[PDB]
Amino acid sequence: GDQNPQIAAHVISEASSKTTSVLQWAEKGYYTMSNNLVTLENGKQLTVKRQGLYYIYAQVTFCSNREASSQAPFIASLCLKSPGRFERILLRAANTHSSAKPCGQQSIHLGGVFELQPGASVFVNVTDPSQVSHGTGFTSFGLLKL
Amino acid sequence: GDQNPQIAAHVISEASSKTTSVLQWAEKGYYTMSNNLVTLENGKQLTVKRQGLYYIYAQVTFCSNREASSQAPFIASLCLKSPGRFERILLRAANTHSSAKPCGQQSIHLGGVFELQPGASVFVNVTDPSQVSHGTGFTSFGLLKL
Amino acid sequence: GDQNPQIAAHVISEASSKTTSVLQWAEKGYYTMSNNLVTLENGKQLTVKRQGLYYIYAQVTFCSNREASSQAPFIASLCLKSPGRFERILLRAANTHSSAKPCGQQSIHLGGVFELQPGASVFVNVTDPSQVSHGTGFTSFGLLKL
């Protein structure tokens, strides 16, 4: 206050206690939720209350074994739920593990501009949630209205 | 309409049928072209009609063999054509294949703020176009005016 | 002039001549410093003179041996100095080297939205500065006010 009412979010990773495969987040650590027109709904997803173009991003780090998760690539997907609609993938990134190298810590950065409908919402899928790296700083998600 | 006339683009990968090495794009899938002051020109490049600072980004995923493409690193470059000017690289990212691991799916994220002249334009170069991953969600390109 | 007075920066890598581990930058090559309300202070850090939300990003490429830097992962961190405050990490990315593969060129992209206080400032830490790749286009840092 007053220095906020742009629409923007930045949210921090947290481990799911359920079989997952969508990422959970919190409003903790270095977080942003600049106003009531974004919210973290659990979800866990970022829900916008205004239509328009948004820059949307995620970062996922994981630590992984090649010979153990041999299935085969890690992939993180930015996905969209719009009201009364099926779900879409917006972005995906793959990284390999590569059989048989050891618990390698790797990151993924995803980002682009998309239209959102009022009522929104965006989330992140991964193939390998147990392998995900829970920070600090390592795994995050957010958006900004342009 | 009306919810658009920011300058912004987001465009989706597509395979070239020519020996390449610049990426081709389409206005398909989750795409954005928010007004007539950006266009996808083929090219394929994003052409802006206004000067100013832009955030510009690409994401390139590829699937690659180490022992096969042994040449040696994959590199994706964000490059600039300005009117009556030579061409410049703005950003580059390298990823290794690493001789001899198998068709490993890897991604690259590129992004930064740059000045563009009226009439523009930006494109993406790669070393290894055949290895590029054509989505969905995998390979993309765009920009936003700040 | 006039086409600038957004707050934005984009700055280019340069090798430290000191034992480091924070990255040095220059206002060279494709750089941006859109006004006196951002500066590159050495530092080297980006210092803002206004409070508010910023998109902040870095890209770090490095070339690395697994068996040589065996310690074990490369990590780049976006960090914050706020006036009269301790220092915080905003973002981190890890990449592995993976013992024993050869001088592999790899990149990292970091980015998110954060609040900055007047007087600011942000910088990038790495584990392995000697391994860092000094462009052109390879290693960069910047921000934009939203």
Domain ranges of chain B: 1-146
Experimental approach taken: X-ray
Structural contact between residues C36 and C53, judged by C-beta atoms closer than 8 angstroms: no
Q: What is the rounded distance in angstroms from the CA atom of residue A90 to the CA atom of residue B136?
A: 8
Subunit contact C105:B94, Cβ cutoff 8 A = yes
For A143, half-sphere exposure in the C-beta direction (CA atoms, 13 angstrom radius) is 29
| Residue in chain C lying closest to B118 (CA) | C3
Distance from CA of C99 to the nearest CA of B (A): 12
Q: CB neighbours of A17 closer than 8 A, spacing ≥ 6?
A: none
How many CB atoms sit inside 10 A of residue A28's CB? 11
Q: What is the rounded distance in angstroms from the CA atom of residue B140 to the CA atom of residue C26?
A: 29
A107 forms beta bridges with A61
B118 touches chain C (CB under 8 A): no
Structural contact between residues C24 and C44, judged by C-beta atoms closer than 8 angstroms: yes
**C136 closest CB neighbour out of B89, B99, B108:** B89
Provide the pairing of β-strand C73-80 with C122-126: antiparallel
Nearest partner of B59 among A138, A113, C140, judged by Cα: A113
Q: What is the rounded distance in angstroms from the CA atom of residue A95 to the CA atom of residue A108?
A: 8
Cα B14 → chain centroid: 11
Cβ neighbours of C56 in B, within 8 Å: none
CATH number of C1-146: 2.60.120.40, 3.50.50.60, 3.40.50.150, 1.10.287.980? 2.60.120.40
**B101 closest CB neighbour out of A52, A92, A98:** A98
**A140 closest CB neighbour out of C91, C115, C146:** C91
Expressed in Å, this structure's resolution amounts to: 2.0
Q: Helix, strand or coil for residue A113? A: strand
Cβ neighbours of A87 in B, within 8 Å: none
C140 touches chain B (CB under 8 A): yes
How many CB atoms sit inside 10 A of residue C130's CB? 13
